[PDB]
Amino acid sequence: AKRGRKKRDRKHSKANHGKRPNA
């Protein structure tokens, strides 16, 4: 749902290089 899309999309911040725990 909306909840799921947010965290996966928020992982694409250049700060974390794209790899984060828990997708």
Q: Is 22 within 8 Å of 6 (Cβ atoms)?
A: no
Q: How far is the CB of 16 from RNA (least distance, A)?
A: 5
Q: What is d(CA 14, CA 3) in angstroms, rounded to the nearest whole number? A: 21
Give the contact letters, 1-23, x = binds to RNA (CB under 7 A), - = no: xx-xx-x-x---xxxxx-xxxxx
Q: Is 8 within 8 Å of 20 (Cβ atoms)?
A: no
Q: How far is the CB of 20 from RNA (least distance, A)?
A: 5
Q: Which residues bind RNA (CB under 7 A)?
A: 1-2, 4-5, 7, 9, 13-17, 19-23
